[PDB]
């Protein structure tokens, strides 16, 4: 009966730390204690306890006696949702940052209509030049079509 | 002077030097105390130029923890004298004198070669290790070899 | 028209530097801030050179000899007219630009941390007008790069070809389609598949 | 942040006082012993920050190789100062600037 | 640096002596060696005085 | 949770094992091939939701056509192992289990690694043929991949005809290695020539042979 | 006389006509720099 | 067969009596002409095609960039082209410069960005270090009460060995990036350190993601344990795929009336090679996954897929810069390297080991 007394004590205190309702508080945790009866169970407690005494948010312990819906905080799967507001804004902010850093870069380059592709015959092409041949022979131009992806070189 | 300890690789981030007419990478605290500055306030006093540089000081710890077993001068003098090639059997008596005239002459000869001045060389090595640990922690670009 | 198209391009540059210095620039995926910045500048300047070069090319009349030698396709192409009538353009060193040999500056004739177009290689004239000394120096640097690479790769390719030829020099086509080597290892059962 | 002995001038390693349940800095070369005011012994920071570092700025006002701006100083409201970009540059460091007034000799930024 | 510079510009010290100040890490280096490649230049009077 | 990924891996492995046992010439009825997942969870896992490998073994008999074209084909025994680091113990008893019923080929799927001293216990089970495979290998069927074309093992004669058309000796053909996934997918032995039908963009369909070792 | 290791510390003007910045627009003579970030040199 | 598809494709009836409008004599002359020319256009027995191939590949090489650059202004995008790449191809160098997998997707995922980001997150590798913000060692004596006033409510909300504390703070952006939670990590640590390390963790909606640790002179050991923790704890990922790139593709697919039209579909281009694991991931089209370290392609898919992959590589390399080789040469080259059972690179080790004449090998 260790938990039968401790789950209560901790619930009572961390739910008062925020007159007659004693039986409504006791009825709720007693239903919640046998609810977790559905060592992995112990891990479920730490979730309930922590979000309550994470003060900062009075709403939770302050908005837990007014009304609420009770059996929801069990198969919740809303650990992101259950308090508090600023955090939710961050997890929505951090997500966009993570979705952005998971992608990759692209290509810039200038396009001119002074060349034509041999495949699709479009006048959108970038280029650059290197010295492939000797010091007597002219430069070598490398062209690339910015439509189909074709590439060619100049003499 | 070589700095070991690859970024989180190679286990110890220790510093080991190299001398003329020796065989193995001799540590650095051993050459400091081998020149005659056995405490630690004098060593960390020579190397770093501030008492707030706890990052360089953070990298220094393994050097003193490496040079703990030697505590006075003669055992470090002969610690160096035994490696420096030479013959094989110039024990403590003559071998200490061998390492001594090694650490007067070959080591940093452009500074001086007359006795009673090893302080000067200790200051110089302080500046050198300082510059190395300024380049390693990335506060100043590596030298260009073609300037 | 050409001088104005460059002026707005140059003015535009002044804007990108401003953003980068007030932390208001979008970071590109896979790239640090400074890489994205350098990429951006280069796109703007290369567009300007092409835009200016395209302008000079289209003005030309229907007897400008060069338009006949290029229009005939016998010798040259667009970059020549562009680099003789408009702007010489950019200078490159290993894909990146004129690095800082001196500490935090290109030449001693410039201040520190100067990054305007002409401060890191962007030539601004055409060979008919002339070249300022700094621009001439950078151009000489780029040409030297070209001559070095040309001096490097050719022998490499030659030795590569010697390995290829010494590897493949006994593969024949025997009287029935097989493509056997020197001792019968059928390489291809039917030459060229057809 | 670590200390040194007063009877040997060697550094003090953290020693445990098992009985009184307290921390001390005790010399390993001598017999010196000192109480520890802070509970922390070791810190290893992995990911870092800072895009600042104006570095050494003494006599940086007359340095002829530095550019000048008409930025007004928050201190003396003078509109003539030298500016630079940062010191100790990582590959990820910002391109924001540091201004140094030629009148009041104060380093300021732009926020 | 000013006094040494003028004592160079007067001819007392050999003119090919280098007086180099790194104001950054605070180093005052003087070079009087053989082999240094150098070249002449005009002088601009920068002193805020006259 | 983590249960479904393990169950899915074991399922895919079993399916790949069956298709492998189907392309080699044996007989697997469609009630066994088209097994969905609820049958697997219901017929393999314990009430705890955990597998029993000893309920996945089976025997295989050859079809008539494959019996006619390929003559040296007996039966097939397929057993998934139980222990993780397969040592000498399970290998020896398994070898006895094959030496008991006198069957012709067995497949001993291991999990992580096999000890070398037990890796010598394979030429001790003759005249049978024990063939080892890892499980984390057979999660993907390499034959549905784009690049890999069809490989069709030949019979005894057709090989002689092929050596008569080109006037050859068995050593002068393009070779394949004994340990090369599409060479043990079919179970080859020294002297068996697989036929390949590659695509080509100069004549569409190009047939090229290749021998093993 | 200035050498190489000193050249880092100095600051040079190219032409004498640059020592006193002017108060043009021509297509023949080239485009000289501007020193965009320097409203006052020394 | 392709040629028969050509002749049957051209000379069908309406395209003869309603477009070409031939008669009879001309028709016969044409069939005879086709036969004659096809019989004239065959190969000639006695034709050293190996030399012609080695030259016809050895010639476009001597006029190609020896440093190429491009993407040079980007450090996140590395690529080897031109010479160095060809040299790393003809050598079968077991270590290249830019390993990169090209992973496709299923149809449901290919065009829904959210699922593509999920599979994008499932593959990438991550150690425990990749989320740590700060590591801190404390001498906090009381086993059931703390000095750190932050963790006071945790220990006082936890109870309903060694006196040294190993406490570390994480970063939320990456604990949300990899879609992890506090428990799962705590489970990882408790599994990897058995029972020695007593672990304590805090709720998600705190203000700092904190992990407290104890063990059952006691300082250096905790440092070694700490570095070991940061260095050897994985939380997911295919070990060896340190970067993933979301990439767009425009492919051509037939319509409903049999007409090819374009189509925009996403795909993955990742850094680091590890095929035998990425092939077996749900959502991945395991049949289309392709790499470019054809040594592994040999160790996974056999010799034929390796041949096709090698050809594709050489075709890409030569085809990057406008040059165009004809096919039987490259097909010969790639069918000489892989015609004994394994990759036989062209240097001296791969060749010298053959059974040719001694003079033919000593003359090299
Ligand atoms: Zn095209
Ligand atoms: Zn002491
Ligand atoms: Zn001021």
Q: At C141, which helix (H) or strand (E)?
A: helix C133-167
Q: Is the peptide bond before C90 cis (omega within 30 degrees of 0)?
A: no
How many Cβ atoms sit within 10 Å of the Cβ of residue F185?
Answer: 20
Q: Does A148 show up as a binding residue in the annotation?
A: yes
Asked if C56 contacts C94 with a C-beta cutoff of 8 angstroms, the reply is no
Identify the CA nearest to A155 among candidates A137, A146, C82.
A137
Q: At B55, which helix (H) or strand (E)?
A: helix B54-66
SS3 state at D99: strand
Dihedral in degrees, nearest 10, Cα atoms C129, C131, C135, C141: 110
Asked if D101 contacts D62 with a C-beta cutoff of 8 angstroms, the reply is no
Asked if F198 contacts F149 with a C-beta cutoff of 8 angstroms, the reply is yes
CA distance H55 to H60: 9
> What contacts D79, CB < 8 A, 6 or more positions away?
D70, D71, D72, D73
* Domain ranges for chain F: 1-140, 141-213
Asked if C171 contacts C181 with a C-beta cutoff of 8 angstroms, the reply is yes
Was domain F141-213 assigned CATH 3.40.50.800?
no
Asked if B94 contacts B84 with a C-beta cutoff of 8 angstroms, the reply is no
How many Cβ atoms sit within 10 Å of the Cβ of residue H98?
Answer: 14
CA distance A138 to C77: 12
Nearest CA in chain C to D93: C33
Q: In this structure, what token pair is assigned to residue H85? A: 């790449």
Identify the CA nearest to D2 among candidates H92, B53, A145.
B53
Are chains E and G touching, using the cut-off of 8 Å on CB pairs and a minimum of 3 such pairs? Answer: yes
Asked if B78 contacts B93 with a C-beta cutoff of 8 angstroms, the reply is no
Ligand 2 centre to CA of B60 (Å) is 18
Burial tier of H24 (Cβ tally within 10 Å: 0-12, 13-18, 19+): exposed
CA distance F184 to F193: 13
Question: Pairing mode, if any, of strands D81-84 and C186-188?
Answer: unpaired
**What structural domains and CATH numbers belong to chain D?**
1-44 (2.20.25.10), 45-111 (2.20.25.10)
CA distance F143 to H300: 11
Alpha carbon distances (Å) from C168 to A45, D27, D31, H151, H356: 74, 75, 81, 74, 13
| Beta-bridge mates of residue H271 | H100, H243
Q: What does the buried/exposed string (b/e) look like for E37-46 if buried means 16 or more CB atoms within 10 Å of the residue's CB?
A: eeeeeeeeee
| Beta-bridge mates of residue E18 | E31
The separation between the first and the last C-alpha atoms of chain E, rounded to the nearest angstrom, is 20
Identify the CA nearest to H146 among candidates H164, H168, H171, H169.
H164
Nearest CA in chain E to D87: E24
Asked if F185 contacts F20 with a C-beta cutoff of 8 angstroms, the reply is yes
Q: At B78, which helix (H) or strand (E)?
A: helix B73-81
Residues in chain G: 42
Alpha carbon distances (Å) from B38 to B28, B67, B68, B71, B116: 12, 10, 11, 7, 17
Among B40, B57, B139, the residue with its CB nearest the CB of D88 is B139
Q: Is C177 left (phi over 0), alpha (psi -120 to 50) or beta?
A: left
Q: At C144, which helix (H) or strand (E)?
A: helix C133-167
Cite the beta strand spans of chain C per DSSP E: 179-180, 186-188
Identify the CA nearest to F139 among candidates H284, H309, H293, H121.
H284
Dihedral in degrees, nearest 10, Cα atoms A141, A144, A150, A155: -10
Alpha carbon distances (Å) from H115 to A99, H104, H106, H282: 12, 13, 10, 12
CA distance C164 to C192: 19
Burial tier of D28 (Cβ tally within 10 Å: 0-12, 13-18, 19+): middle
Question: Angle between the A22-35 and A2-14 helix axes, to the nearest 10 degrees?
Answer: 130
Q: What is the DSSP letter of C93?
A: B
| Cα-Cα-Cα-Cα dihedral sign, residues H312, H318, H322, H323 | negative
Q: In this structure, what token pair is assigned to residue C22? A: 């007030």
Q: What does the buried/exposed string (b/e) look like for H101-133 if buried means 16 or more CB atoms within 10 Å of the residue's CB?
A: bebbbeeebbeeeebbbebbbbbbbbbbbbbbe
CA distance C71 to H202: 75
Q: In this structure, what token pair is assigned to residue B41? A: 């306030």
Identify the CA nearest to F181 among candidates B46, D43, H303.
H303
| Cα-Cα-Cα-Cα dihedral sign, residues H328, H334, H337, H339 | negative
Q: In this structure, what token pair is assigned to residue H332? A: 């010969």
Task: Specify the CATH number for H115-236; select among 3.40.50.300, 3.30.450.40, 3.30.1360.140, 3.30.1490.100.
Answer: 3.30.1360.140
CA distance H336 to H326: 17
The backbone torsions φ and ψ at residue H237, rounded to the nearest 5 degrees and listed phi first, read 85, 150
Radius of gyration of chain A (CA): 33
CA distance F67 to F72: 8
CB contact under 8 A, G42 and D64: yes
How many Cβ atoms sit within 10 Å of the Cβ of residue H220?
Answer: 10
CB contact under 8 A, D4 and B71: no
CA distance H103 to H95: 21
Question: Angle between the B118-136 and B54-66 helix axes, to the nearest 10 degrees?
Answer: 120
> What contacts D51, CB < 8 A, 6 or more positions away?
D86, D93, D94, D96
How many Cβ atoms sit within 10 Å of the Cβ of residue C87?
Answer: 26
SS3 state at C67: helix
Residues in chain C: 194
User: Which residues of E fall within a CB distance of 8 Å from G6?
Assistant: 18-20
Identify the CA nearest to C83 among candidates C12, C13, C14, C131.
C131
Radius of gyration of chain C (CA): 25
Q: Is A84 left (phi over 0), alpha (psi -120 to 50) or beta?
A: beta
Dihedral in degrees, nearest 10, Cα atoms H17, H22, H23, H27: -120
The separation between the first and the last C-alpha atoms of chain H, rounded to the nearest angstrom, is 42
Asked if D46 contacts D32 with a C-beta cutoff of 8 angstroms, the reply is no
| Beta-bridge mates of residue H102 | H269, H290
Q: At C58, which helix (H) or strand (E)?
A: helix C33-59
Place of tokens 């314990």: F46
Q: What is the DSSP letter of C105?
A: B
> What contacts H105, CB < 8 A, 6 or more positions away?
H116, H119, H265, H266, H267, H268, H283, H284, H285
Identify the CA nearest to H272 among candidates H317, H239, H230, H249.
H239
What is the DSSP secondary-structure string of chain A? -HHHHHHHHHHHHHTT----THHHHHHHHHHHHHHTT--HHHHHHHHHHHHHS-TT-HHHHHTSSSS--STTTTS---TTTSS-HHHHHHHHHHHHHHHHTTS--------BSS---SSS--S-EEEEEE--S-SSSPPEEEEEESSS--EEE--
User: Which residues of G fall within a CB distance of 8 Å from D67?
Assistant: 37-38
Place of tokens 């690179």: H345
Any CB–CB contact under 8 A between H300 and chain F? yes
CA distance F210 to F195: 6
Closest chain D C-alpha to C123 CA, distance in angstroms: 22
Angle at B82 between CA B79 and CA B84, to 5 degrees: 110
Place of tokens 């004590």: A9
Residues in chain B: 147
The backbone torsions φ and ψ at residue H113, rounded to the nearest 5 degrees and listed phi first, read -65, -30
Alpha carbon distances (Å) from C48 to C51, C92, H277: 5, 16, 48
SS (H, E, C) chain H: CHHHHHHHHHCCCHHHHCCCCCCCHHHHHHHHHHHHHHHHCCCCCCCCHHHHHHHHHHCHHHHCCCCCCCCCCCCCCCCCCHHHHHHHHHCCCCCCCCCEEEECCCHHHHCCHHHHHHHHHHHCCEEHHHHEEEEEEECCCCCCCCCCCCCHHHHCCCCCCCCCEEEEEECHHHHHHCCCCHHHHHHHHHHHCCCCEEEEECCCCCCCCEEEEEECCCCHHHHHHHHHHHHCCEEECCCCCCEEEEEEEEEEEECCCCCEEEEEEEEEEEECCCHHHHCCCCCCCCCCCECCCHHHHHHHHCCHHHHHHHHHHHHHHHHCCCCCCCHHHHHHHHHHHCCCCCCCCCCCHHHHCCCCCHHHHHCC
Q: What is the DSSP letter of D10?
A: P
Ligand 2 centre to CA of B77 (Å) is 22
Experimental determination approach used: cryo-EM
CA distance H35 to H84: 47
Asked if H348 contacts H361 with a C-beta cutoff of 8 angstroms, the reply is no
Any CB–CB contact under 8 A between E22 and chain G? yes
Identify the CA nearest to D97 among candidates C20, C27, C10.
C20
Distance from chain centroid for Cα H154: 45
SS3 state at B103: helix
The separation between the first and the last C-alpha atoms of chain B, rounded to the nearest angstrom, is 22
Question: Pairing mode, if any, of strands F76-80 and F105-110?
Answer: parallel
Question: Angle between the C33-59 and C2-21 helix axes, to the nearest 10 degrees?
Answer: 170
Radius of gyration of chain B (CA): 16
User: At how many Å resolution was this determined?
Assistant: 3.8
Q: Does A117 show up as a binding residue in the annotation?
A: yes
Identify the CA nearest to H334 among candidates H326, H325, H324, H344.
H344
Q: What is the DSSP letter of D37?
A: S
Which of residues 48 through 67 in chain D touch E, CB cutoff 8 A? Answer: 55-56, 58-60, 63-64
Q: Is the peptide bond before A84 cis (omega within 30 degrees of 0)?
A: yes
Instruction: Report how many Cβ contacts below 8 Å link chain F to chain H.
Output: 70
CA distance G28 to H229: 70
What is the DSSP secondary-structure string of chain E? -HHHHHHHHTSSS-TT-EEEEETTTTEEEEE--S---EE--------TT-
Angle at D76 between CA D70 and CA D79, to 5 degrees: 10
CA distance H158 to H81: 59
CA distance H169 to H132: 6
CA distance C180 to H336: 11
SS3 state at D22: strand
Asked if H146 contacts H140 with a C-beta cutoff of 8 angstroms, the reply is yes
SS (H, E, C) chain F: CHHHHHHHHHHHHHHHHHHHHHHCCECCCHHHHCCCHHHHHHHHECCCCCECHHHCCEEECECHHHHHHCCCCCCEEEEECCCCEECHHHHHHHHHHHHHHCCCEEEEEECCEECHHHHCCCCCCCCCEEEEEECCCCCCCCCCCCCCCCEEECCHHHHHHHHHHHCCCCCCCCECCCCCHHHHCCCCCCCCEEEEEEEECCCEEEEEEEECC
Question: Pairing mode, if any, of strands H126-127 and H234-236?
Answer: antiparallel
Q: Which CATH fold topology does B1-147 show? A: 3.90.1110
CB contact under 8 A, E23 and D58: yes
Which of residues 3 through 32 in chain G touch D, CB cutoff 8 A? Answer: 9-11
CB contact under 8 A, C157 and H339: no
Q: In this structure, what token pair is assigned to residue G5? A: 């290791």
Question: Pairing mode, if any, of strands H234-236 and H132-138?
Answer: unpaired
Alpha carbon distances (Å) from H163 to A64, A141, B59, F65: 38, 71, 27, 76
How many Cβ atoms sit within 10 Å of the Cβ of residue C124?
Answer: 20
SS3 state at D107: strand
Among F202, F203, F208, the residue with its CB nearest the CB of C189 is F208
Burial tier of C115 (Cβ tally within 10 Å: 0-12, 13-18, 19+): buried
CB contact under 8 A, G1 and E38: yes
Q: Is H82 left (phi over 0), alpha (psi -120 to 50) or beta?
A: left
CATH architecture of the region F1-140: 3-Layer(aba) Sandwich (3.40)
* Domain ranges for chain B: 1-147
The backbone torsions φ and ψ at residue C93, rounded to the nearest 5 degrees and listed phi first, read -135, 110
Place of tokens 């979730």: A47
CA distance H226 to B144: 38
Instruction: Report how many Cβ contacts below 8 Å link chain D to chain G.
Output: 15
Burial tier of H21 (Cβ tally within 10 Å: 0-12, 13-18, 19+): exposed
Place of tokens 């193995």: B24
CA distance H221 to G9: 52
| Beta-bridge mates of residue H138 | D40, H165
């Amino acid at each position: 009966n260790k938990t039968r007394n401790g789950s209560i004590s901790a619930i009572y205190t961390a739910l008062a730390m925020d007159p007659s309702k004693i039986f409504e508080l006791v009825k709720d945790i007693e239903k919640q204690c046998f609810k977790a009866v559905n060592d992995t169970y112990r891990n479920k407690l730490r979730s309930l306890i922590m979000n309550l005494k994470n003060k900062n948010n009075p709403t939770l312990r302050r908005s837990i006696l007014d009304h609420e819906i009770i059996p929801s905080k069990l198969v919740t799967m809303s650990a992101q949702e259950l308090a508090p507001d600023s955090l939710k804004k961050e997890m929505e902010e951090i997500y966009k940052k993570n979705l952005f850093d998971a992608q990759g870069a692209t290509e810039n380059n200038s396009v001119t209509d002074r060349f034509e592709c041999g495949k699709c015959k479009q006048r959108k092409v970038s280029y650059f030049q290197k010295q492939t041949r000797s010091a007597a022979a002219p430069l070598t131009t490398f062209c690339k079509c910015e439509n189909c992806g074709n590439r060619w070189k100049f003499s | 002077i070589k700095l070991y300890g690859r970024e989180d690789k190679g286990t110890g981030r220790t510093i080991k030097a190299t001398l003329p007419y020796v065989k193995q990478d001799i540590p650095i605290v051993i050459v400091f105390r081998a020149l005659g500055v056995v405490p630690d306030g004098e060593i960390l006093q020579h190397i770093c130029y501030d008492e707030n540089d706890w990052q360089m000081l953070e990298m220094l710890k393994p050097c003193i923890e490496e040079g703990f077993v030697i505590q006075d001068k003669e055992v470090a003098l002969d610690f160096i004298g035994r490696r420096g090639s030479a013959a094989l059997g110039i024990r403590r008596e003559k071998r200490i004198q061998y390492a001594k005239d090694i650490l007067q002459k070959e080591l940093l000869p452009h500074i001086t070669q007359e006795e009673g001045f090893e302080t000067r060389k200790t200051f110089f090595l302080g500046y050198m290790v300082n510059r190395l640990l300024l380049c390693a922690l990335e506060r100043k670009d590596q030298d260009d070899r073609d300037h | 028209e050409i001088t104005h198209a460059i002026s707005s391009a140059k003015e535009q540059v002044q804007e990108i530097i401003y953003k980068a210095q007030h932390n208001e620039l979008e970071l590109k995926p896979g790239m640090t801030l400074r890489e994205s910045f350098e990429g951006e500048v280069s796109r703007t300047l290369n567009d300007a050179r092409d835009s200016a070069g395209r302008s000079a090319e289209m003005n030309l009349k229907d007897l400008n000899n060069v338009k006949q030698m290029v229009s005939a396709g016998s010798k040259g192409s667009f970059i020549n007219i562009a680099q003789m009538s408009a702007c010489v353009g950019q200078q490159m060193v290993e894909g990146k630009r004129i690095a800082f040999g001196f500490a935090d500056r290109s030449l001693p004739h410039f201040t520190k941390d100067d990054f305007s177009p002409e401060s890191k290689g962007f030539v601004e004239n055409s060979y008919l007008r002339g070249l300022t000394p700094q621009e001439f120096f950078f151009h000489a640097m780029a040409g030297r790069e070209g001559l070095i690479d040309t001096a490097v790769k050719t022998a490499e390719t030659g030795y590569i070809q010697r390995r290829l030829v010494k590897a493949l020099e006994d593969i024949m086509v025997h009287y029935d389609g097989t493509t056997r080597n020197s001792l019968g290892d059928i390489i291809q059962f039917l030459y060229g598949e057809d | 942040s670590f200390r040194f002995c007063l009877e040997c001038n060697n550094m003090l390693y953290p020693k445990e006082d098992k009985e009184n349940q307290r921390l001390l800095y005790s010399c390993r070369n001598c017999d010196y012993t000192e109480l520890a005011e802070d509970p922390k012994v070791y810190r290893h920071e992995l990911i870092t920050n800072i895009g600042e570092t104006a570095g050494i700025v003494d006599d940086i006002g007359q340095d002829p190789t530095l550019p000048r701006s008409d930025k007004e100083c928050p201190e003396c409201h003078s509109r003539d100062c030298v500016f630079f970009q940062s010191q100790q540059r990582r590959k990820d460091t910002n391109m924001t600037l540091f201004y140094v007034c030629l009148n009041c000799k104060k380093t300021f930024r732009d926020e | 640096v000013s006094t040494m510079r003028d004592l160079r510009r007067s001819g007392a010290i050999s003119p090919e002596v280098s007086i180099i100040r790194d104001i950054r890490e605070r180093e005052f280096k003087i070079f009087t060696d053989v082999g240094r490649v150098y070249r002449p230049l005009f002088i601009v009077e920068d002193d805020e005085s006259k | 949770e983590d249960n479904n990924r393990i169950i899915s891996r074991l399922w895919r492995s079993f399916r790949t094992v069956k298709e492998m046992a189907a392309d080699r010439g044996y007989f697997i009825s469609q009630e066994e091939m088209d097994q969905s997942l609820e049958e697997f969870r219901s017929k393999i896992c314990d009430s705890m939701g955990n597998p029993q490998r000893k309920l996945m073994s089976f025997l295989a008999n050859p079809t008539p056509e494959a019996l006619e074209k390929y003559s040296d084909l007996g039966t097939l025994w397929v057993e998934f192992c139980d222990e993780p680091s397969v040592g000498i113990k399970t290998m020896r008893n398994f070898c006895l289990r094959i030496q008991e019923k006198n069957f012709s080929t067995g497949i001993f799927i291991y999990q992580n690694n096999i000890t070398p001293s037990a890796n010598k216990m394979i030429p001790t089970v003759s005249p049978a043929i024990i063939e080892t495979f890892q499980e984390s290998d057979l999660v993907v069927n390499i034959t549905h991949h784009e690049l890999v074309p069809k490989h069709i093992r030949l019979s005894d004669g057709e090989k002689s005809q092929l050596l008569q058309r080109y006037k050859l000796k068995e050593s002068q053909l393009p070779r394949i290695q004994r340990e090369d996934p599409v060479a043990r997918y079919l179970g080859l032995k020294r002297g068996q020539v697989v036929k390949i039908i590659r695509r080509s963009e100069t004549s569409g369909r190009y047939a090229s042979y290749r021998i093993c070792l | 006389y200035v050498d190489g290791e000193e050249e880092e510390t100095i600051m040079i003007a190219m032409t004498p006509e640059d020592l006193q910045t002017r108060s043009l627009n021509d297509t023949a003579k080239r485009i000289k720099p501007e020193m965009s970030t320097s409203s006052h040199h020394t | 067969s392709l040629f028969q598809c050509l002749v049957r494709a051209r000379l069908a009836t309406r395209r003869i009596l309603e477009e070409f409008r031939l008669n009879r004599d001309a028709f016969e002359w044409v069939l005879g002409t086709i036969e004659a020319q096809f019989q004239r256009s065959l190969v000639h027995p006695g034709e050293m095609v190996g030399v012609i191939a080695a030259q016809s590949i050895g010639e476009p090489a001597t006029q190609m960039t020896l440093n190429t650059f491009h993407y040079a202004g980007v450090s996140s995008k590395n690529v080897t082209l031109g010479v160095p790449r060809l040299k790393e191809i003809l050598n079968v160098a077991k270590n290249i410069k830019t390993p990169a997998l090209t992973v496709y997707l299923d149809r449901e995922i290919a065009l829904d960005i959210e699922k593509a980001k999920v599979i994008q997150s499932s593959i990438e590798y991550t150690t425990l270090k990749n989320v740590t913000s700060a590591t801190e060692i404390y001498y906090d004596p009381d086993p059931t009460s703390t000095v750190i006033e932050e963790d006071f409510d945790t220990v006082e909300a936890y109870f309903s060995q060694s006196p040294w504390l190993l406490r570390l703070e994480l970063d939320r952006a990456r604990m949300l990036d990899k879609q992890l939670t506090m428990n799962q990590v705590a489970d990882k640590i408790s599994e990897v350190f058995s029972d020695d390390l007593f672990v304590m963790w805090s709720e998600d909606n705190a203000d700092k993601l904190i992990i407290r640790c104890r063990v059952i002179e006691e300082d250096q050991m905790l440092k070694r344990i700490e570095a070991h923790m940061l260095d050897l704890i994985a939380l997911r990922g295919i070990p060896g795929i340190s970067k993933v790139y979301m990439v767009k593709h425009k492919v051509s697919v037939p319509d409903e009336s049999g007409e090819y039209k374009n189509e925009e579909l996403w795909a993955l281009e990742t850094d680091g090679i590890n095929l035998a694991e990425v092939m077996a991931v749900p959502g991945v089209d395991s049949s289309r996954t392709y790499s470019n370290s054809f040594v592994e392609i040999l160790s996974v898919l056999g010799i034929e897929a390796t041949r096709s992959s090698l050809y594709k590589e050489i075709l890409n390399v030569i085809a990057f810069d406008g040059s165009y080789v004809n096919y039987r040469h490259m097909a010969l080259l790639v069918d000489v390297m892989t015609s004994r059972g394994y990759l036989m690179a062209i240097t001296r080790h791969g060749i010298n080991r053959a059974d040719t004449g001694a003079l033919m090998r000593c003359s090299f």
